[PDB]
Amino acid sequence: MEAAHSKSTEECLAYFGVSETTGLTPDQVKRHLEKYGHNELPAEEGKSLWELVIEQFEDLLVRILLLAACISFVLAWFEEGEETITAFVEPFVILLILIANAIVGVWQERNAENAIEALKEYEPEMGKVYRADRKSVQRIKARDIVPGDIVEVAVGDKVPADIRILSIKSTTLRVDQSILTGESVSVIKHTEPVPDPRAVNQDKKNMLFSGTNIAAGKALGIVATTGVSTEIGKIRDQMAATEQDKTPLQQKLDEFGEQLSKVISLICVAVWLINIGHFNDPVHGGSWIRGAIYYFKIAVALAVAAIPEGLPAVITTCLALGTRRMAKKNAIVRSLPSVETLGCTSVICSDKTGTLTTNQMSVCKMFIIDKVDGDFCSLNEFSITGSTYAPEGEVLKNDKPIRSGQFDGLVELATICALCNDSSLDFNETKGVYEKVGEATETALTTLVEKMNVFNTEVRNLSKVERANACNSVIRQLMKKEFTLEFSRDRKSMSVYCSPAKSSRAAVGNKMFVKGAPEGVIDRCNYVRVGTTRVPMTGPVKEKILSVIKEWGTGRDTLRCLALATRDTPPKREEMVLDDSSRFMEYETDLTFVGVVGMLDPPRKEVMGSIQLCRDAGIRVIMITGDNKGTAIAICRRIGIFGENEEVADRAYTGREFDDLPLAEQREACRRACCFARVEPSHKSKIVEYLQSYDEITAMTGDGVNDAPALKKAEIGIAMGSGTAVAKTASEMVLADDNFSTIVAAVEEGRAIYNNMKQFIRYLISSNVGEVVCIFLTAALGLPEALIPVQLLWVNLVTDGLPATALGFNPPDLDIMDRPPRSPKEPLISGWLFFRYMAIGGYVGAATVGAAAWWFMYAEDGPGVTYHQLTHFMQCTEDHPHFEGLDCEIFEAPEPMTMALSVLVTIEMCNALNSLSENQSLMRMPPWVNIWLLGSICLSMSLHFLILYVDPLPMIFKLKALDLTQWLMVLKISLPVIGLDEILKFIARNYLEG
Numbered sequence: 001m002e003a004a005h006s007k008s009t010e011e012c013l014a015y016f017g018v019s020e021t022t023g024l025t026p027d028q029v030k031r032h033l034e035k036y037g038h039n040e041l042p043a044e045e046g047k048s049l050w051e052l053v054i055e056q057f058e059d060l061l062v063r064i065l066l067l068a069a070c071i072s073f074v075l076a077w078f079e080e081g082e083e084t085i086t087a088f089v090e091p092f093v094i095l096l097i098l099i100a101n102a103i104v105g106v107w108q109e110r111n112a113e114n115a116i117e118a119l120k121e122y123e124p125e126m127g128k129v130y131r132a133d134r135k136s137v138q139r140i141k142a143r144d145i146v147p148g149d150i151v152e153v154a155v156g157d158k159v160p161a162d163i164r165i166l167s168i169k170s171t172t173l174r175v176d177q178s179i180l181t182g183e184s185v186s187v188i189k190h191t192e193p194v195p196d197p198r199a200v201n202q203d204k205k206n207m208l209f210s211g212t213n214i215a216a217g218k219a220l221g222i223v224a225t226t227g228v229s230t231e232i233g234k235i236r237d238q239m240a241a242t243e244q245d246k247t248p249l250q251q252k253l254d255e256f257g258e259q260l261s262k263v264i265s266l267i268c269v270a271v272w273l274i275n276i277g278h279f280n281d282p283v284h285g286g287s288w289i290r291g292a293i294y295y296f297k298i299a300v301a302l303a304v305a306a307i308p309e310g311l312p313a314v315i316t317t318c319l320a321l322g323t324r325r326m327a328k329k330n331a332i333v334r335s336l337p338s339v340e341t342l343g344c345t346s347v348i349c350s351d352k353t354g355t356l357t358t359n360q361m362s363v364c365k366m367f368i369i370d371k372v373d374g375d376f377c378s379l380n381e382f383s384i385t386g387s388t389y390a391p392e393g394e395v396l397k398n399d400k401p402i403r404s405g406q407f408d409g410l411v412e413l414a415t416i417c418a419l420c421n422d423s424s425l426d427f428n429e430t431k432g433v434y435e436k437v438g439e440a441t442e443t444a445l446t447t448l449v450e451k452m453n454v455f456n457t458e459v460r461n462l463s464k465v466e467r468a469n470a471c472n473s474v475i476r477q478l479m480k481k482e483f484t485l486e487f488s489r490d491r492k493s494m495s496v497y498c499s500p501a502k503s504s505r506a507a508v509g510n511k512m513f514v515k516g517a518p519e520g521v522i523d524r525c526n527y528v529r530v531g532t533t534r535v536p537m538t539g540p541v542k543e544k545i546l547s548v549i550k551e552w553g554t555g556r557d558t559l560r561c562l563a564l565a566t567r568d569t570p571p572k573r574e575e576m577v578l579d580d581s582s583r584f585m586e587y588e589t590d591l592t593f594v595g596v597v598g599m600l601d602p603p604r605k606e607v608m609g610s611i612q613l614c615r616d617a618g619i620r621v622i623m624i625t626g627d628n629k630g631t632a633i634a635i636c637r638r639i640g641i642f643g644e645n646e647e648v649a650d651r652a653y654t655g656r657e658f659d660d661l662p663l664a665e666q667r668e669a670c671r672r673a674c675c676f677a678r679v680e681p682s683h684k685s686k687i688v689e690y691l692q693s694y695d696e697i698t699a700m701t702g703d704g705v706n707d708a709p710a711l712k713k714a715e716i717g718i719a720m721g722s723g724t725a726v727a728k729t730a731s732e733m734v735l736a737d738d739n740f741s742t743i744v745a746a747v748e749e750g751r752a753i754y755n756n757m758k759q760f761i762r763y764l765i766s767s768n769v770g771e772v773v774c775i776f777l778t779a780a781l782g783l784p785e786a787l788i789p790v791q792l793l794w795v796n797l798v799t800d801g802l803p804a805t806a807l808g809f810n811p812p813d814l815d816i817m818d819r820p821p822r823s824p825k826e827p828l829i830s831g832w833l834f835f836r837y838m839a840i841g842g843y844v845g846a847a848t849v850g851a852a853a854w855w856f857m858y859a860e861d862g863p864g865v866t867y868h869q870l871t872h873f874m875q876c877t878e879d880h881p882h883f884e885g886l887d888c889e890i891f892e893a894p895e896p897m898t899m900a901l902s903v904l905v906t907i908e909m910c911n912a913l914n915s916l917s918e919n920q921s922l923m924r925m926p927p928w929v930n931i932w933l934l935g936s937i938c939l940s941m942s943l944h945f946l947i948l949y950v951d952p953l954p955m956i957f958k959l960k961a962l963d964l965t966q967w968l969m970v971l972k973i974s975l976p977v978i979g980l981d982e983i984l985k986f987i988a989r990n991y992l993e994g
C-alpha cells in the first residue's frame with residue numbers, strides 16, 4: 001500500500017480487507033505472497049572471478065596489445081634454421097605481461113566487501129504476526145511476512161517491514177530510526193494520519209520502518225510494503241545498480257589510448273602512401289602471403305612503441321606506496337585510484353552526527369534561582385565542559401571552576417537528574433571508553449551528575465568501571481524510587497515517586513521529581529526553589545526563567561532544554577491511579593521549579609580548523625544531515641560553515657523544502673546552500689549528484705547507514721572509523737582516527753601524489769614518442785629494423801620502468817595546500833609542452849635511425865655503403881651489381897640495433913633527469929635532488945650491460961656489447977639532449993607564462 005501514512009487505520013485495514021482482530025487468512029497470505037514476493041532484500045554478489053578476468057581485457061590499449069600479440073604469433077611461424085634460436089620469444093613476452101600484469105588487476109577488484117550484505121544485517125530473522133490461522137501471536141520467519149499482515153512489535157524488536165501503526169499498547173512507542181536518520185534519539189509514534197503525502201521519514205510518526213528498532217513500548221500494526229518497496233529498500237537500490245565512475249586521470253588515459261588507436265592505425269596506412277612504388281613495375285619475390293608480411297610487422301612494431309606498457313605497473317606502485325603512507329596517517333584507502341581523485345576535490349559533503357559531532361549528548365549549560373525580590377529575579381547560571389559521556393569535565397560559574405555541592409539548588413537539580421532517569425552509563429573495558437545505556441538524553445543527565453559530584457564523593461581512586469555510576473548510586477541511596485509516571489504526549493514530562501530511604505510506607509517526606517518540556521512543567525509550578533527554601537512563583541520570576549530558556553533554545557547555541565521540578569507534597573501512593581496515564585499531569589501539579597539544563601551533541605574539537613584549512617585549499621564543505629535544521633544551523637555556526645551572525649534564509653533547507661523546489665532550483669540550491677537538514681538517504685545522493693553535474697569532484701563523509709547512498713555516489717566516500725559497517729563498505733577510505741583533520745592531509749597526499757604521476761606519465765609517454773619516430777623513419781625511409789618489438793618492451797618496463805617509479809618521489813611543493821582544486825579536465829600535455837615533447841620526440845626518433853645508419857656508413861666495422869643503397873638491404877641477391885661489397889647475411893646482426901638501442905637508453909636516462917621538473921633549468925634545480933632517480937639510472941644502465949655480457953640474454957634480444965669505442969659515440973648522440981630541452985625550458989621560463 002502506497003502512502004499508508006496518509007490514510008487512517010481503518011482505511012489501511014480496509015485496503016487489504018483484513019481484520020485487526022484476526023489477521024490474514026491462509027489464503028490471503030498465499031495470494032499476497034505471490035503478488036508481492038518475500039519480505040526480503042535481493043542479495044547482490046560480486047562478479048565471479050571469470051568476470052574479473054574478462055574485464056581486465058576491456059582496455060583498448062590492451063585489446064590492441066593483444067590483437068598485435070596475435071599477429072606476432074601468426075607471422076611467428078616463418079622462421080628457419082638461421083634464427084630458429086629465437087623464433088617465439090616475442091609472442092611469449094608480448095602476452096606474458098599482457099596477462100601477468102592484467103592478472104594483478106584482479107587483485108584490486110576481487111578484493112571488496114559487499115555493502116548490501118552489510119545492509120541485510122538489519123533484516124530480523126523472525127517477526128510476529130496474527131494470522132487468521134491461530135488465536136495466539138505467531139513467530140515466523142520475517143521473509144515470510146507480506147503486505148496486509150498484522151504485525152506486533154515490542155521493546156527490543158528490530159522492525160520486520162514498513163508498517164503502518166494500528167494500535168499502541170504502551171503509554172508510548174519509542175523508536176530508534178538511525179538507519180534512516182543517523183540520529184539515535186527516540187522518536188515518539190502515534191496512530192493518526194499524516195496528511196502530507198510527501199512527508200519525509202522524520203515526519204511519518206505513524207509508521208514503523210523495516211530495519212529500525214523499538215526502544216520502548218508495544219504496538220500492533222499492518223504491513224504497508226515489504227522487500228525492496230521499503231525505506232531500507234531504497235537505500236538497497238542506490239547501492240546495487242550504481243557502479244563508481246572512472247577517475248579523472250583514468251579518463252585522461254582513455255582519451256590518450258583512444259587517440260593512439262587512430263594515430264597508429266593512420267601511421268600504417270601512411271606507409272601505404274609511401275609504398276606506392278614496388279607495386280607498379282613488374283617484380284616478384286614471393287606470394288602475397290609471403291610479401292604482405294611487411295605491413296603486419298610494422299604494426300607489431302608500433303604496438304610496442306606506442307602503447308606505453310610498464311605504466312600500468314609504475315602507477316599501481318606509486319599508489320600502493322601512497323596508500324601505506326596515508327595508512328600511517330590513519331587513512332585506510334580501500335581504492336587505490338581514489339587517492340589521486342581526493343587530490344582534486346572541490347566540494348566536501350559531510351554528515352553531521354558522529355561525523356562532525358561526537359554523537360554524545362552533553363549537558364553544557366544549567367541554571368537555578370539565585371534570589372527573588374518583587375519584580376527582581378536573578379539566576380545562578382553555570383556551564384559544563386566535556387563533550388563525551390565520560391565523567392570528565394567541570395562546572396563553571398563565569399568561566400571559573402566551582403563546587404556544585406556549594407549550591408543547594410544544584411544538589412536538588414542533581415538529585416532530580418539522577419532519580420527521574422531510566423538510563424545509566426557503562427565503561428566498555430574492551431574499547432576503553434564510556435558508553436551510554438539507554439536514551440542519549442538521559443545518559444547526558446547521568447554524566448552530568450557524575451561531573452557535578454554534589455556530595456563530594458571520592459572517585460579518583462575508583463576503577464573506570466566503578467567511576468561510571470558512582471555519584472548516581474550515592475543519590476540513589478538517599479531516596480528510594482517507588483515507581484515512575486512514564487512520559488505522556490499530552491504532558492510532555494515525566495516523573496518519579498520517591499520516599500526517603502529507611503522510612504515507613506506511611507512515613508511523610510515522599511517526593512515526586514519531575515522532568516520535561518519547560519513550558520508545561522513551568523506552568524505547573526506554583527513555587528520556585530531558592531537554595532533549600534521555596535517562594536511563590538510570580539509573574540516576574542516566570543518571565544526571567546522563560547526568557548533564558550528562550551535564549552538557550554534558539555541562538556548560536558540552540559540547546560535542547562529541560563525544566564526540573566519536584567512536588568514537595570505528592571499525593572498519597574494509595575490515591576494514585578498508575579494504570580491511567582491521562583491522570584499523570586494532575587499528579588504532577590503544585591510543583592516547585594528547581595532548574596534547567598541545556599544539552600546538545602557537540603562538534604568535534606578539530607573540525608572548525610579542518611574546515612578553515614579546506615577553505616584555504618579552495619574546498620567547500622556542505623553539511624547534509626537527518627537531524628533538525630535549528631540544531632543543524634547552530635552546529636554550522638559553531639564549526640565555521642556559517643558566520644556567527646550570518647543570514648542563512650536561502651543557505652539552509654530541510655528535505656521537505658528542498659523537495660518543493662523545481663528541478664532547476666534544487667540544482668542551483670546545492671551551489672548556494674551549505675546546510676541541508678531533516679533529509680532522507682536519497683536526498684544525500686541527490687545533492688551529491690547535482691554537485692557532480694557542475695563537473696565537480698565531490699567527496700562525501702559520514703558514518704551512518706543513511707549515508708551509504710551518498711558515500712557510494714560521491715567520487716570519494718569517506719567513512720568514520722567508529723562508524724557502521726555499511727558506511728565503511730560503501731566508502732573509498734576510512735578515517736580509523738575519526739579525525740576530520742585526517743581528510744585534509746589525505747587531500748594533500750592526493751595532490752602531492754598526482755604531481756609526481758604527472759611527471760612519470762609524461763616521461764613515459766614521451767619515450768614512447770621517440771620510439772614511434774624511429775619505426776616510422778625506418779619504414780618510409782627504407783632503412784632496416786633499427787629496433788625490434790622485442791626490445792622496446794624491456795625498455796618500457798625495466799629501462800624506463802625504473803626512472804618512472806623514481807620520479808614518483810620528487811619532493812612536493814610547499815604551497816601544495818595554498819592553491820585551489822585543479823580542474824578535472826586539466827590536460828597533461830598541451831601547448832609549449834606539446835611542442836617541446838614533440839621536438840624531443842622526433843629527436844630521439846632520428847637519433848636512433850641515424851645512429852644505426854651511422855654504424856654502417858660513416859663509422860667502423862660497418863661497410864661505408866652510402867644511403868643510395870643502404871636502404872636496399874632487401875636487395876642483396878636480387879641486385880648484386882648495384883649492391884655488393886661485403887657479406888650479405890649480416891644485416892640482422894647485433895650492430896645496427898646494438899647501436900640504436902644504446903641511444904634510446906642513454907637518451908631516456910637523460911629525459912628522466914629532465915622530467916625532474918616541467919619548466920625548470922637542471923642547472924637551477926639540482927638534478928641530484930631525487931637521489932632515487934640517480935640510483936634508478938645506475939640500475940637501468942647496469943641492466944643494459946647485464947643484457948649484453950651474459951650471452952643467455954642478448955641471445956634473444958640480439959645485441960652484442962660494444963667496446964670502449966663505439967659507446968663513446970653513443971654518449972655524444974644523446975648527451976646533447978640535455979641542452980635541447982634546456983633551451984626549451986628557457987623559452988618557457990622567459991618568453992612565456994608560468
Ligand SMILES: C/C=C(/C)C(=O)O[C@H]1C(C)=C2[C@H]([C@@H]1OC(=O)CCCCCCC)[C@@](C)(OC(C)=O)C[C@H](OC(=O)CCC)[C@@]1(O)[C@H]2OC(=O)[C@@]1(C)O
Binds near residue numbers: 255776830833
Ligand atoms: C604513444 C606515442 C605516440 C607518438 C602517439 O601517437 O602520441 C600522440 C597522442 C595519441 C597524443 C600526443 C601524440 O601526438 C603527436 O605527437 C602528434 C603526431 C606525431 C606523428 C609523428 C609521425 C610518427 C601526446 C602524447 O604527445 C605530444 C608530444 O604531443 C600528448 C597528449 O598526451 C597526454 O597528455 C598524455 C595522456 C596520458 C595527447 O594529445 C595525445 O592524444 C590525446 O588525446 C592527448 C590529449 O592525451
Ligand SMILES: Nc1ncnc2c1ncn2[C@@H]1O[C@H](COP(=O)(O)O)[C@H]2OC3(O[C@H]21)C([N+](=O)[O-])=CC([N+](=O)[O-])C=C3[N+](=O)[O-]
Binds near residue numbers: 441487494561562
Ligand atoms: N509530535 C511531536 N512534536 C514535537 N515534539 C515531540 C513530538 N513527539 C515527541 N516530541 C518530543 O521531542 C523529542 C524528539 O525530537 P528532538 O529532541 O530532536 O526535538 C522527544 O524527546 C522527549 O519528548 C519528545 C521525550 N520522549 O520522547 O520520551 C522525553 C523527555 N524526557 O522527559 O526526558 C523529553 C523530550 N523532549 O523533547 O524534551
Ligand code: ALF
Binds near residue numbers: 351353355624625707
Ligand atoms: F549523522 Al547524520 F545526517 F548527521 F546521518
Ligand SMILES: [Mg+2]
Binds near residue numbers: 351355
Ligand atoms: Mg552520522
Ligand code: NA
Binds near residue numbers: 710711712713717730
Ligand atoms: Na564513493
